[PDB]
Design a protein around this ligand. Sequence first.
Ligand SMILES: OC[C@H]1O[C@@H](O[C@H]2[C@H](O)[C@@H](O)[C@H](O[C@H]3[C@H](O)[C@@H](O)[C@H](O[C@H]4[C@H](O)[C@@H](O)[C@H](O[C@H]5[C@H](O)[C@@H](O)[C@H](O)O[C@@H]5CO)O[C@@H]4CO)O[C@@H]3CO)O[C@@H]2CO)[C@H](O)[C@@H](O)[C@@H]1O
Ligand SMILES: [Zn+2]
Length: 472
Amino acid sequence: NWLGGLSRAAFPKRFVFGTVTSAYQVEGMAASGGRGPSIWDAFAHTPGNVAGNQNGDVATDQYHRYKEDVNLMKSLNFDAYRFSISWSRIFPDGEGRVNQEGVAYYNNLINYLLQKGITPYVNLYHYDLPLALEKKYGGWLNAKMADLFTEYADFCFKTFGNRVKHWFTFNEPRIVALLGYDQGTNPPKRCTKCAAGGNSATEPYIVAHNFLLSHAAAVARYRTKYQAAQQGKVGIVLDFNWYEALSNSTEDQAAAQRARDFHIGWYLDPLINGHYPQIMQDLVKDRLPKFTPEQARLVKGSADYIGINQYTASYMKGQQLMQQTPTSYSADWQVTYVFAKNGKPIGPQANSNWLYIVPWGMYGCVNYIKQKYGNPTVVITGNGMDQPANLSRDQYLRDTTRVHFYRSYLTQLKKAIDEGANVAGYFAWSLLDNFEWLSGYTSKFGIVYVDFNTLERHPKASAYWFRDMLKH
Ligand SMILES: OC[C@H]1O[C@@H](O[C@H]2[C@H](O)[C@@H](O)[C@H](O[C@H]3[C@H](O)[C@@H](O)[C@H](O[C@H]4[C@H](O)[C@@H](O)[C@H](O[C@H]5[C@H](O)[C@@H](O)[C@H](O)O[C@@H]5CO)O[C@@H]4CO)O[C@@H]3CO)O[C@@H]2CO)[C@H](O)[C@@H](O)[C@@H]1O
Ligand SMILES: [Zn+2]
């Protein structure tokens, strides 16, 4: 049967199923409703930065259509919705004056979700730093971000936390560090060779450190000021794609483990264990900032659950570890990526070149966190795949590859849960086709098709698959 034996009965009692969007990717009204610009508004409005010079000015216009979209997710039998608050929609300058119209939008959205029995899971940040903070403070290179983010978080807790009980601070800080400060392809476009300036060997580490310190400061504020009354939880969302040793050689096993540590351990060792991974300390040395004992104690245990965005897997080949002149966070890993073993590709690619369809990577990642980190509460906060541009409406709707994707990946997640992994929920990226960053509207991740000419929603086969799977 097309469900492959999956249903709510196949997952733990009270297991949460949801869909996910982010503010800039779906809201629209980017320069309206009092919203100030983010670093992504400036970036996307610069010719050449995004596919087709597209931007999020309108996106899916969820800002006007949110009741349609909430009705849809309820009709598809989801329990929860992960979305983000745009910092610059609340504080157009990132600090100071509150945009009451922006506050009203999120109140209306939260209230409608609750009215319809959908639990809000709310990210405070999803790549969309207020442009004013980038210009005034230098964004995530500045340790002052911990104060600025904490004050923003405090406002959100105060304003929405009587209703919102499930928060995340950040979304995929690794990707901000990597694309914004190593490769320099995402805002602020910093890197060693970059026009904007930068240093690919140092800045990614500074940025990650400031995300960890800012997360910890915001959670300390929640716990000391809001938790007693509100009795909610705050976590963080981290991307983790799987790394599998190419062979059982000591060298290849070491490489796959180094990759895991530089990818997920970079954040999870501080959050769970109060230190960076040993291998990062050993290889990155003076370029890796040091937590003081007090900071480490603030960071350790500061996530009530770990959000994991899981998409793909790679084979890793090793090499003898060498003394080398530092060049980048990426090069520091001293690994070699491989996408075939014994002449066979690890899996077929979705539209995005990086996204190999490898359902056993889901098991790999979840089992690994279970075994390495004392089985922390994990929520799969994003998982999905994309179709390419230029298909017909009907071609988008007949998304049989995505149906197969969800059935296979969820079977692998179930395998890990059945083996004892402490996974509390699962969220599909994305509810809607949306603005896919550098790919603009040329990458379609939704279980619901969005016609970007008319803005009409049409559920795809995968949406109906979820509806059938999730029926109560
Ligand atoms: O995107 C959908 C949705 O999901 C969330 O976040 C996504 C995010 O949007 C993506 O940008 C991001 O993509 C990264 C991949 O996950 C990751 O595997 C990939 O890793 C690269 C690595 O950075 C690079 O060094 C390496 O290059 C080597 C080549 O492979 C070799 O051929 C060559 O010889 O050597 C070079 C250098 O060693 O390749 C690897 C493998 O691709 O980096 C991607 C960044 O482009 O994934 C996120 C989740 O994983 C997000 O929540 C939503 O907002 C978003 O819309
Ligand atoms: Zn509109």
